[PDB]
Design an enzyme around this catalytic site. Structure first.
Site, PDB file in Angstrom:
ATOM      1  N   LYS A 115       0.806  -1.216   0.000  1.00 46.08           N
ATOM      2  CA  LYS A 115       0.000   0.000   0.000  1.00 46.08           C
ATOM      3  C   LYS A 115       0.843   1.273   0.000  1.00 46.08           C
ATOM      4  CE  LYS A 115      -2.448  -0.811   3.808  1.00 46.08           C
ATOM      5  NZ  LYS A 115      -1.965  -2.190   4.034  1.00 46.08           N
ATOM      6  N   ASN A 138      -3.418   5.926   5.951  1.00 49.83           N
ATOM      7  CA  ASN A 138      -2.784   4.904   6.777  1.00 49.83           C
ATOM      8  C   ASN A 138      -1.258   4.920   6.692  1.00 49.83           C
ATOM      9  OD1 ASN A 138      -3.373   2.434   8.528  1.00 49.83           O
ATOM     10  ND2 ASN A 138      -2.046   1.545   6.926  1.00 49.83           N
ATOM     11  N   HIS A 183      -4.784  -9.016  10.641  1.00 38.18           N
ATOM     12  CA  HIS A 183      -5.769  -8.385  11.534  1.00 38.18           C
ATOM     13  C   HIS A 183      -6.848  -9.338  11.992  1.00 38.18           C
ATOM     14  CE1 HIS A 183      -3.772  -4.677  10.712  1.00 38.18           C
ATOM     15  NE2 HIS A 183      -4.074  -4.717   9.429  1.00 38.18           N
TER      16      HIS A 183
END
Ligand SMILES: CC(=O)N[C@H]1[C@@H](OP(=O)(O)OP(=O)(O)OC[C@H]2O[C@@H](n3ccc(=O)[nH]c3=O)[C@H](O)[C@@H]2O)O[C@H](CO)[C@@H](O)[C@@H]1O[C@H](C)C(=O)N[C@@H](C)C(=O)O
Ligand SMILES: Nc1ncnc2c1ncn2[C@@H]1O[C@H](COP(=O)(O)OP(=O)(O)O)[C@@H](O)[C@H]1O
Length: 439
Positions: A115, A138, A183
């Protein structure tokens, strides 16, 4: 949107929460802020006029709210927050707030890995075109701090957590780069629940950029007329592998010989393809975008060589915070001598077993630390040592290092059990590498 006279409650006293406090104050709304942590990192930085509540969520404040602004670090499934949702109280995150205010097109990037690289690349492509660009999310610069009516393009790195609380995103171009387990401590319905959060990024996107090699990056109704693909051997954007040379291609046309890139590795070449696909969709000139691919040097903490000395490479891959990213470091990795691999921290309930296939042979040593250290050592006990801390692991491995060896921090875990952030973990590794890797 208008928040005048509203009772606004922010959950989270970290970077996001502080950015939200400033956002509301600047528009004449005094919010209240809470955090389940007893002493959250933002407590000392909070304006003295703002009411705060720490150590738990305050149900009196939540149930009284007109608007709840949830930092990505609090689960919507938290019983107090779930109760507020049940009562019909509006819950949004900082990215939702941003989308409601932003007045330039948004390129939006999610995925389990790559990302920040893709986000930064698209930013560099915009800069090379002379576009006033804001890059955040983020990646570490809270999105609300980007807001500027002179900005001509926003590039947002988005997590699955931020996506859960976002409803007003209409990206000019959006991608999920890949979906691999992460996660899980936040997704008790497993991989598909995690994926579902990421799939929100495509809602109302003008163009979707999907990974041809990863079916989970496609919308559930499948690819539609909006949907441009990148991949290795297939895709609208793909690679050409011939004679030790690699090219980026778009629909059969060569656009870049990767020898011109400063980055290497197949996953970075597909990162480049995704960035180019997004830039093209955002209307950036192709020529300047390709130029940006050749100037970009990489980001700190992403397979960063912090010391190459006396025949040993010390590599800070602190941003490898899940199994997929450590796999990307290990897959096809060349080491002349022994790999000394540092693993550990907050494993987030990950299954570490996919790493085992890379840890065979006589030239691998594991140094496992932090909360889930024991689980990591269990990958191959006969070559593993366990310590409490990374520093102890580094001091244990250093005497064993020989010319030709690699020391690699690619921990497959988050850092918050022992560090302020993954940057601190990377910086501490670099300091220790410089101490221990020199006579
Ligand atoms: C966990 C997360 O989503 N972190 C992102 C967040 O940083 P911020 O400091 O605002 O985080 P936060 O929402 O306050 O949460 C931080 C930590 O506090 C915990 N927390 C938070 C609120 C609370 O009431 N109780 C509590 O225990 C969270 O579980 C988490 O462990 O907002 C920043 C700006 O958008 C991001 O750069 C940062 O990405 C970090 C690098 C990250 O780890 N992101 C995850 C999603 C990832 O990349 O995998
Ligand atoms: N396409 C990819 N697939 C898997 N791992 C990747 C990919 N691109 C980069 N990585 C690795 O993932 C980690 C973080 O990548 P980065 O670009 O910072 O993205 P993220 O913001 O998703 O963590 C780094 O350790 C990096 O080497």
């Amino acid at each position: 949107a208008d928040y005048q006279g509203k009772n606004v409650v922010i959950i989270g006293l970290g970077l996001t929460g502080l950015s939200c406090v400033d956002f509301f104050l600047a528009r004449g709304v005094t919010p209240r802020v809470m955090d389940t942590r007893m002493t959250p990192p933002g407590l000392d930085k909070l304006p003295e006029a703002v009411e705060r509540h720490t150590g738990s969520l305050n149900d009196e404040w939540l149930m009284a709210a007109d608007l709840i602004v949830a930092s990505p670090g609090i689960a919507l499934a938290h019983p107090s927050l779930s109760a507020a949702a049940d009562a019909g109280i509006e819950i949004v995150g900082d990215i939702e707030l941003f989308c409601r205010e932003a007045q330039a097109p948004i390129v939006a990037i999610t995925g389990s890995n790559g990302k920040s690289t893709v986000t930064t690349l698209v930013g560099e492509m915009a800069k090379a075109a002379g576009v006033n660009v804001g890059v955040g999310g983020n990646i570490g610069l809270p999105a609300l701090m980007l807001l500027d009516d002179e900005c001509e393009l926003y590039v947002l790195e988005l997590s699955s957590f931020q996506l859960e609380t976002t409803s007003s995103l209409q990206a000019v171009a959006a991608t999920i780069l890949n979906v691999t387990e992460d996660h899980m401590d936040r997704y008790p319905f497993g991989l598909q629940q995690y994926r579902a959060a990421k799939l929100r990024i495509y809602e109302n996107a003008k163009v979707c950029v999907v990974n041809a090699d990863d079916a989970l990056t496609m919308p559930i109704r499948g690819a539609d007329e909006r949907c441009v693909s990148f991949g290795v051997n297939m895709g609208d954007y793909h690679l050409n592998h011939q004679q030790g040379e690699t090219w980026l291609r778009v629909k059969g046309e060569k656009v870049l010989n990767v020898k011109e890139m400063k980055l290497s590795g197949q996953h970075n070449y597909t990162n480049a393809l995704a960035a180019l696909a997004l830039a093209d969709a955002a209307g950036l000139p192709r020529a300047s975008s390709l130029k940006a691919l050749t100037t970009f040097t990489g980001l700190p903490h992403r397979f960063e060589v912090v010391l190459e000395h006396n025949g040993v490479r010390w590599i800070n891959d602190s941003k490898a915070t899940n199994v997929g990213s450590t796999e990307a470091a290990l897959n096809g990795l060349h080491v002349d001598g022994t790999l000394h691999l540092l693993l550990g921290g907050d494993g987030k309930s990950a299954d570490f077993s996919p790493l085992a296939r890379y840890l065979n042979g006589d030239n691998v040593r594991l140094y496992c630390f932090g909360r889930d250290g024991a689980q990591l050592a269990a990958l191959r006990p006969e070559v593993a040592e366990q310590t409490e801390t990374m520093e102890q692991a580094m001091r244990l491995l250093a005497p064993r290092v020989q010319p030709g060896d690699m020391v690699l921090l690619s921990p497959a875990c988050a850092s918050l059990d022992q560090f302020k952030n993954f940057e601190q973990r990377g910086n501490e590794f670099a300091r220790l590498a410089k101490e221990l890797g020199s006579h």
